Every structure is written in C-alpha cells, then in structure tokens.
Design a protein around this ligand. Structure first.
Ligand SMILES: [Zn+2]
Lengths: 7, 195
C-alpha cells in the first residue's frame, strides 16, 4: 500500500 | 510528554529511521526524527515490532529501487496537479519514504507536516489494520472529513483524513488544539485510540 503526501 | 518519554520515543525511532547514503542535511534529518518522536510511543513501538522502516531520502522517491515502478504514475488525489510520484516528497502505507527538507506545508505538498502524515498512513495500515476504512471512522469521516480543508483530498479519502488528523494531533499543541475545535469526534477518536 502506498499513499501520497497531501497535494 | 515527559522528557524521558520523548527520549524513549527517540530511542525507538533510532531503530526505525534509515538515513540515506551520501551527503544530506543531517540537522534537518534530526529535526524530522524529533517531530516524529512526539507520536505516542505505543504506535512507534508497534512500528518497530513490525520492522517498518522510515527511510529519509536525499533525492526523489522514484530513484529508490522499491518505488521505480511508480515513475510517471499520477498518485491518488493528484489528478490535475500536473505531477507524478517522481515529484511527490512523501509516501506512506506498507512503507514510509520521505524527502529531507520537505517537511513544512508548501514544500511540494500541502500537509501540515510531511513525515507525520506519511507515518500516520503506516500506523493506520500496519499497526491499526486499516482503521481509517472501518465503519466507525467512516461515520466520523462523513461528518467531519471536510472541516480540515483540502476537501477534494482529505474530504474524499478517509485514509487521508485520518493521516492528516493524526498529524494535527501529534505535531504540536497548536495543531492539536486546532483539530479539537474543528473535528471534535475525530479528536476524541484519536484520543481513545492511544489509550
Ligand atoms: Zn496521504
């Protein structure tokens, strides 16, 4: 699972 | 958090944080660890038990072998920003990877703090078995998920609302107070989670 920083 | 507890957390993080090879900002890397040390030691010890590594990076995330497959890929919620994972400064989930120097809001991201948001994803997924997608949190998210701004990211993905709320709770007293006033149910939820 990967989740990005807030745009 | 007493000094001994903060020190205990820094010791725990000494077993989790991986620094890059080559030259990098050692002072800023230490500053990032110090901010992570305010996370409840319960979560930090669970991260260490699961051999989760918090990798601090000197370059782009996609320069790392394990993230090369993300080259050119547009992350969830980054549609229209015009960037791909190559430009994203932080990643959280099954792993944690963070660009040194990009902690603050506005450094290629709009989180209140890069490392706490990314590590919150790891705690959510690894330590708490994806509690952010539990029925309980989804009910809280439905009500309060649009009260922290960035409603087209935080207000849309419960796991992102959880991670940012977690960062607000643990970054400092100011952000902890801001969360309590904006998202009281989320604040109480996180407060009970740490017990
Ligand atoms: Zn995220």
């Amino acid at each position: 699972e990967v989740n990005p920083a807030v745009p | 958090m007493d000094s001994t507890t903060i020190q205990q957390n820094k010791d725990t993080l000494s077993q989790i944080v991986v620094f890059p090879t080559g030259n990098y900002d050692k002072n800023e890397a230490n500053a990032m660890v110090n901010r992570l040390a305010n996370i409840d030691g319960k979560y930090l010890n669970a991260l260490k038990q699961n051999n989760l590594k918090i990798k601090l990076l000197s370059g782009k995330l996609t320069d790392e072998k394990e993230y090369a497959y993300l080259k050119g890929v547009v992350p969830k919620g980054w549609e229209g920003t015009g960037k791909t994972w190559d430009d994203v400064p932080g990643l959280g989930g099954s792993t944690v990877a963070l660009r040194i120097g990009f902690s603050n809001k506005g450094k290629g991201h709009d989180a209140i703090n890069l490392e706490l948001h990314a590590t919150a994803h790891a705690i959510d997924h690894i330590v708490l078995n994806d509690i952010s997608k539990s029925a309980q949190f989804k009910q809280i998210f439905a009500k309060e998920g649009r009260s922290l701004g960035n409603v087209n990211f935080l207000g849309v993905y419960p796991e992102e609302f959880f991670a940012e709320s977690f960062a607000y709770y643990y970054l400092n007293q100011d952000t902890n107070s801001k969360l309590k006033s904006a998202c009281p149910q989320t604040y109480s939820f996180l407060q009970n989670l740490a017990k």
